[PDB]
Amino acid sequence: SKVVVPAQGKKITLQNGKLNVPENPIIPYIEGDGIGVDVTPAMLKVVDAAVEKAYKGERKISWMEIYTGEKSTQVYGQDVWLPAETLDLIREYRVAIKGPLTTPVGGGIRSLNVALRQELDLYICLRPVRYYQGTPSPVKHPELTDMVIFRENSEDIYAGIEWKADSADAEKVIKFLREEMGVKKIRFPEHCGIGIKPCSEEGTKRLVRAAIEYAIANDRDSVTLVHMGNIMKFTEGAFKDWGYQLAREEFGGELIDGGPWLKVKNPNTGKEIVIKDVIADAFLQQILLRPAEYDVIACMNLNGDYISDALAAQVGGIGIAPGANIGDECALFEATHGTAPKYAGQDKVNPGSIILSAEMMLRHMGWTEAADLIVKGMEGAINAKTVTYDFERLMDGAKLLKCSEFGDAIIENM
Amino acid sequence: SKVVVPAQGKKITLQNGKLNVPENPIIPYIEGDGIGVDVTPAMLKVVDAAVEKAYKGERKISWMEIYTGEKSTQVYGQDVWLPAETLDLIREYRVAIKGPLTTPVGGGIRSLNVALRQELDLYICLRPVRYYQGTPSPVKHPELTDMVIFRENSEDIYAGIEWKADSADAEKVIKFLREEMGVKKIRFPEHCGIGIKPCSEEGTKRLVRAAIEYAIANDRDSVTLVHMGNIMKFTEGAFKDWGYQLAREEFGGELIDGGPWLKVKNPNTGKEIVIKDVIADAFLQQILLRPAEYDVIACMNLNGDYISDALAAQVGGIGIAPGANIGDECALFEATHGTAPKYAGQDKVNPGSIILSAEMMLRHMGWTEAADLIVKGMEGAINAKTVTYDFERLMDGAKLLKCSEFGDAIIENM
Predict the structure, then answer these.
(1) For chain A, which has fewer Cβ within 10 Å, the N-terminal or C-terminal residue?
(2) Is B317 left (phi over 0), alpha (psi -120 to 50) or beta?
(3) B198 and chain A: CB distance < 8 Å anywhere?
(4) Residue B391's domain is classified under what CATH number?
């Protein structure tokens, strides 16, 4: 019911782990709640422009609206926050894009962002953060940050295995812990809440396999594994050891000096990719202090969340950091920010994060000329100092532009 | 066996939740491994100076060496990393100080820092981070950071309840989760590692009671509760709700506008302490971007670890951030950094973090004139630009001083 398939357009298809992409492809998009009604029109107008320019008129995306979040209840019953349908059309048309989603409070429904990521097994959350010349930054030297994050999306504490304090189930599990497993380290068991953090071999190796394979494809200098593993030996300490095992076994890694770090062969280039580890709290500090020593990061779901958001802040963008959730069978590109409902409908917020995730969506389909064009576009709009509220409270002599007008400034510069 | 009690000195005593502190008190100190052999001589020389000056000769600390870490095996059997004795002498003499401790790898022995913190129920880890005028910083505006962290120390994932992947126990607990509790959200159960994160009411309220009581004592503007609670409803989401319940019930909190944030009465001053919440990933960004809006932070063990280390980096100090572990019955002041064994014995490392934790130790005994004197001392040593390797690679026209020589520069300036 209510999604209308367009007339002209063909579905993308998978053949030999590679995508066959039509000249006229169907790409679904979820508009988003709150500021989604503003940034999703800017993204469609500028992607459309960037492929009319790049392929001088021969390719054209056919856009199809699908639903999640608040707009879905409007469209069906107030009861439904993620229609079973949406999950099928992201896997069928293989590549889709989304704006922001908030979830109802308390009321059973778990973060919709993670319902989608987990129900479609999008196990790689990829978050590249680089500096755009001319962005107001908090830090002194932000040009030294050019990092790419592979945050694991299927596991960690972020899975949602938790029981309410004084639940009949919470008491069921703490009794099992004290009686059957000999756990003395629980300080207060009466009125206590419990969560489970799982970490496995086949889940941490599929994420670090993609992170090393991406360093090889893009001629990157190092892969850092971050983990708070001196305290959590068997979940984060295990992920450090299992990621090293994999660079030894599937990628032929070899010892530097005498440890712990390894050296890996680029087959396409013969350069030497270093594989290292930093414990995550020291890493949080390492990213402000010695940022050029780090490049590709591989980490678990909660660590990757905090590191990404921190790195995005460092370089000047809570609001223009691109995102992708990727799996073997499909992919979803998303805006990374909140719904921000106070400033919604008014067209003043920044569309940068959703536009730069449409860039990431275009590089993945293999349309790199239209994507390099959307980044030529963003570097000029900003060099020319013409920008949105969030970059103008911060600087001198910038001209203030609305959200629909800033997309038109991206087209001007490509 | 081997700790020698000094001849002149009396033990500190507790009476009515307050300390009775002798003119000639006994304070134990654990030297530390690695750079501990260098920074612990600087701390003793400068504290001794700061009380000969302040009390013109009438008070004198009697220091007593107790043991943990590497030096303990030297002193007893190679088998013992934390002698049962040490735990008794910290609780008996009530206030003690430590240098850094590393733990043996793998080999059963859990992080010695947390064995001490957990076995002595030091449930408040207090970490104040402020900027010292003239420190090389990564960020543009570091003077805006003056924060104090109450990291909870008894719980969270940081407790150490974890089982090896493919352990007989790990399979015991995942079978209980799938069969008896109906857990479907575990992506890969074969070859999977598990950890438990507990969060309770009597544990989160004793930590937030201290954080509000400290804001009242020191005339602070706000108390922020950080939690990644939109994803972890029942451990971190529970700690947000339980900390609000406590400012309503024991401190008379009242609603601002209409939520969620509260307003609390200062009885000593009638000013208005705001109680707010930020979800932890956005907080990590909020600390770089709007740092003046935050003051006292209350958070769980893993969150408090990452936030502290990040805040310490922001302002210019991985290596001069003070620390205290506090409980109802005793307290331990510590250096926050690693053992750094490469640079050990050579006397080149910074002694700032252990000295500034001896400051914190002196304010707690109630000797505030000797403590204000140790901070007059550090602000001048740095204004005068005379400093250690770690602050000299970073700046212009500084004179290079060794570690024992930098303590002598702190005495000069008080």
Answers:
(1) N
(2) beta
(3) yes
(4) 3.40.718.10
